[PDB]
């Protein structure tokens, strides 16, 4: 009896999957972003002068 939301508001979010449709929408935002992948062996990740490799 101390829930601020009315019964219909709590059930409209529940039946219409409020947060799931948002969750899909955020994932779809990434679809229109630049990916991170680099095309090794045609490109190389960063190296620094302190790097340890072959002796």
């Amino acid at each position: 009896e101390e829930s601020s939301e009315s019964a219909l508001s709590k059930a409209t979010k529940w039946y219409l999957l409020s947060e799931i449709f948002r969750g899909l929408y955020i994932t779809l935002e990434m679809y229109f972003r630049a990916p991170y992948t680099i095309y090794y062996p045609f490109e190389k990740g960063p190296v620094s002068p302190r790097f340890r490799g072959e002796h």
Binding site: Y40, P41, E43, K44, G45, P46, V47, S48, P49, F51
Partner: protein, 70 residues
């Protein structure tokens, strides 16, 4: 990827701003031996490096000689 010459292997990986063809003569390496064509990784071929011991054996067996009594 082993076909990339060592000088440019560093530039390609965003490790340096000066390409090895724009090097200052006071920053090039000085090699007192002839430098040949780049050799890629030779594994899965006949050119694969073979390790061996660079040290001689530590005991030298007697070189036998026979001497005859008087």
């Amino acid at each position: 990827m082993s076909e990339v010459e060592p000088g440019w292997h560093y530039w390609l990986a965003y490790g340096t701003d000066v390409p090895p063809n724009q090097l200052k003569p006071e920053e090039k390496s000085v090699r007192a031996y002839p430098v040949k064509k780049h050799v890629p990784n030779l594994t899965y071929t006949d050119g694969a490096y073979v390790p061996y011991n660079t040290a001689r054996p530590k005991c030298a067996t007697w070189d036998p000689k026979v001497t005859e009594r008087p």
